[PDB]
Amino acid sequence: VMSQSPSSLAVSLGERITLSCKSSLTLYLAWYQQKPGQSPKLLIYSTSTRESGVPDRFTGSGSGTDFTLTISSVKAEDLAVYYCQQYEYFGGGTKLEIKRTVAAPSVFIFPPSDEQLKSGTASVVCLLNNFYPREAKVQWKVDNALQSGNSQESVTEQDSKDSTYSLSSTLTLSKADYEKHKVYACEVTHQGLSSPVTKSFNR
């Protein structure tokens, strides 16, 4: 098994970044760069050789079972996942993301539409818009009863412009179960908030 640490890393444009890969030997190393929806692209092979057209701000090094990929000055087009590879084995990868200032979620709640209720289902959407960093906690409360197991979350990739993330949480009930209660609330916890934010409505 090969390993890369850390799994993700917040970087600032222009700074010097070092990505690490740990191998094991019982029988040299390549690096790939992958952006969303594309196939990986070979960057380094033979531990240190640059693939044709790779900028020389990328350097591969390696000693024993320890390999590094250094970017002397990270550029916007370097934001991607990097994988190391040795024969049949791949590291788990390291995603680069842009470090920016903390940004609190802007939180919005959406009751179920009448059109959905008419179909027999009720989904309540809690939208957490344009926050940073990615880590945030959504907690649904129904008539002040904390919920668990009846919601799912989805997060966008970092935005290209403002480097924020957005997150949706969707609480999904039956219509009969939704109609049994009054107060629907989503509570949001995040680093840019001094105390948790709650968005609620009475159906």
Next chain:
Amino acid sequence: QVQLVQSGPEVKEPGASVRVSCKATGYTFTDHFIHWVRQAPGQGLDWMGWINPFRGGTNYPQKFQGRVTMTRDTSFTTAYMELNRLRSDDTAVYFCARGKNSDYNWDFQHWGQGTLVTVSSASTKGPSVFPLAPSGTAALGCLVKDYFPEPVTVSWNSGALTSGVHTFPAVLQSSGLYSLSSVVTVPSSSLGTQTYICNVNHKPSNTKVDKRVEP
């Protein structure tokens, strides 16, 4: 140029088989091994084995040995990867790959575009589209609920509204159907006057829906 072009997306039930094809052009086909690498959703790269098109000889990793079968058709310059007795965590994008040089097999300079294989017993179903109505910036959206398989596409106002749009990755529900939200933030003063319509395409079902989103 070396070009590897793969077949289109597949949907298979658990226990079935899928066969993915990789057409290789722009070089002497029998001079290089063809590899197969897969990547489950949000996961890393996983090498599945290689074939030597010269006489069809193969090697597979232990994690797949009895389950994957690679073949080639030299006259059609195409490698094939068949994965049998499919399970849900075989859901993944499958790549064929080719090394930089006959010397070193493992420098994967060339990659196919990838083939998405979805393993599920769910049945093809178009989405229902419900409005996320807005309540000096407002949020509105569309809930694209209960569809199979991926993907759907969403635009707003026929592609004219793009700023502030967030279309989320779909979530897999316990039912085996997918569900997705798309939201957009707009000036609240535009709420009464400017119309906001989400356009949802689900081609596997030939579903096209427009939903006007009103206060």
